[PDB]
Amino acid sequence: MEFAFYICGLIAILATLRVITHTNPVHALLYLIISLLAISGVFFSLGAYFAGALEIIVYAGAIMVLFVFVVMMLNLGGSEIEQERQWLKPQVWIGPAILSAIMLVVIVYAILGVNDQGIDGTPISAKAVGITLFGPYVLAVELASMLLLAGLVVAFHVGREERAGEVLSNRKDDS
Amino acid sequence: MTITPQNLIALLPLLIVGLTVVVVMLSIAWRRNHFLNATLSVIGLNAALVSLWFVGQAGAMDVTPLMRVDGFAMLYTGLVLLASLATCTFAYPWLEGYNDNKDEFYLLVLIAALGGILLANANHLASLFLGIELISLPLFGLVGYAFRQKRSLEASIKYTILSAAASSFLLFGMALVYAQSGDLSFVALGKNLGGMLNEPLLLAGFGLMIVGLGFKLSLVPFHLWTPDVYQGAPAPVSTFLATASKIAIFGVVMRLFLYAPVGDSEAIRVVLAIIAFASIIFGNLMALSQTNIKRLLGYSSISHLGYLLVALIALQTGEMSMEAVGVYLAGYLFSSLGAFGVVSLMSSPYRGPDADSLFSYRGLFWHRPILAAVMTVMMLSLAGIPMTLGFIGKFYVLAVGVQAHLWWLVGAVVVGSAIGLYYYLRVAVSLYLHAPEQPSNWQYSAGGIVVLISALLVLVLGVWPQPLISIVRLAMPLM
Amino acid sequence: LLKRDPLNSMMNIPAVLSRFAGKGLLLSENGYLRWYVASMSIGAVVVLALLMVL
Amino acid sequence: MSTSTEVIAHHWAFAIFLIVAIGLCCLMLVGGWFLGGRARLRLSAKFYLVAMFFVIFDVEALYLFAWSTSIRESGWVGFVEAAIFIFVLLAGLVYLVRIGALDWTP
Amino acid sequence: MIPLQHGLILAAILFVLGLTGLVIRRNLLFMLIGLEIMINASALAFVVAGSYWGQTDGQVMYILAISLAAAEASIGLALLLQLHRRRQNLNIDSVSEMRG
Prior knowledge:
This is part of a larger assembly, with chains A, B, C, D and E. Chain C has two helices and no strands.
């Protein structure tokens, strides 16, 4: 099942590469969705069934949904930036990509040299994750519940309209 | 590991802050009252303080692999609760003139206080990560609470983006150190290694963790978020993110570097030495040409965290560095508390989003002289000047640096302090000049007496620092 | 020749160098979030390179 | 695993089922295309609010997803922590009800 | 069967590409997209590290990572639509009024 892992990793790299260098954001979000699907396939190839299940249940099922909601909600089509095409120019694209490639080179130099028993089978079932998550990690789930509550409270406080109607114009500073 | 009901008494400030979070939530849902919710929040924090005393009645425990409670955790937990109490008392007059909802502020302050308590109690990588995110996200709420204002929205955007980047960097670093060593507890991060401590994977993961933590501690060159976030955010928010967030994150950083055997490495120590050197020099040089008090206090936070880092370098040699950091953190807490309290009292109420949120420290003595006296006392304390507790912390960090022969770092501290006192007593004098042009609420008086007790505390503990040293050395963690 | 003080000037060039370094270091605080993330990446690269060299 | 000669048959059946459903849909669209002959504004914030409710309660649901597998392996202490988890979850829920974020009111 | 080095290299590549998209792109929505890419790469690295040692702590860290990703992605999208409702542009270099 290592061939499936290699194919999923290669198409995940290609999908996120097309995410970085795309013009309109809807196809970028679609490529990120298939990248999350490939990452879930990687998760299934390594015995992390619950991780890939949560990847397409939540990461590819709730987060990208929220991004598509906002994109189709405020009617952005990438306009007034897609006529510039500033990221398809050497003076903007060469520098940070060189810096990130230097980061990649040094971090994969750090990756090599470590001993490797290798990825084995014996997939980690969700039952063991449930035992550990409600075992030594009681405070983890309670404080993550409070973290999600705090995020809900903040984004309700910030991202509420306080106006009326299901159609609103982009008026400057909401009158 | 299961939780015994003897371990229930050790979780008491955490559980009471969570219970007052949900009680404040149901009180907002029922009535939507400002004064009642603020009273419930401060009552919950005071009950957390007395239950921290009840924790002190019990011993030092290790509840889960996530959490260990001792005097280290007790001391920085109490600092977090008192900073949150100060934030609430400063924020009530600021929220009195607020148009939108005015209780989610208290809910987020309580949640971020709970995250700071977790960070003080954190003995795990998961607990560290969860605590820094529980500090970050209510800070996203507090900084962008006045989202109608342009500068608060800009500061919230910058803080959210850079903290998400730092959280991802730290998460990748802990992923690398978990790939190297097959455990996530602090004490087991280097147990498998043994002259082979400098593993490249573990070192790279701890470097990424250093990036993600030195963002929060405003260490260079992850320091550029600091003045924008200090300026844009509301003044009680600036108070909270100056005292409590940095105190909790530096406490969990020190517990990480103390329990893990990777602190004996001669590469992480040198990198932190370079970072502290450049942080002290850059922050003190970059607050020099500043006319806004909040930007200047952000750069001052950068310089004081550089002082904290040089105190942290000699952790494995001097054996007094934890005591020095406790004393210095108490002094910095009370000094920043008083200064940002004067800032919040003068910037209260909110007065709408179109109004200018400029402090205008010049001529402050001629209408409110007590606040000017408190502010110049805080400027004396932050400058490493005697009769103040900041000088006691400065003496402690100088002793820590000179005990382990950190001569470059000691010279950096001396040069940075000599640079710093320029703008420190420049502000302290400029608040006594004559301004060209230019209150009786009981909670405004409560904030005034809060900064008054802060000034009395820093003056007394500058002229008599023995009780603070006695209660810091009594709170000695497991070694 | 000493109606203006030379030794005062030669002891004031620490202040001149401090002011020049401050003026050159405030150029980094340009207020752009993109440069802030770029400096974050630069610092991560510097930390990783210093840890790999040492 | 690829050696137990029955679960590998189930894996082959699952993969072939997926690829032949995708191929059936592709060939149906191909048959639709080939045969037949030729001849500013903004929506709201309440949609964002309900989608954020979905994702936040979805993560607070995945915690119960993990709990429900080990509901009998864990003891009554697991029931207590899940009970206070559901209690603070319902506290946030009733907060959203009583404030008014959860209603539409056209 | 599979070396740990290949999975960690994949995670590092995804994190580096997410950082590249975070830096080179002015659109704040694309910056949040790159942030989610970096969080996904860190979570993938934690999952690979957990699966190498045969422990379920990596999946617990993955759960915490995706909880943070959900909450702060909601944070960033709420701030994004607030930015759109106030200044009517999603450009991130335009919101630079606060300078040193």
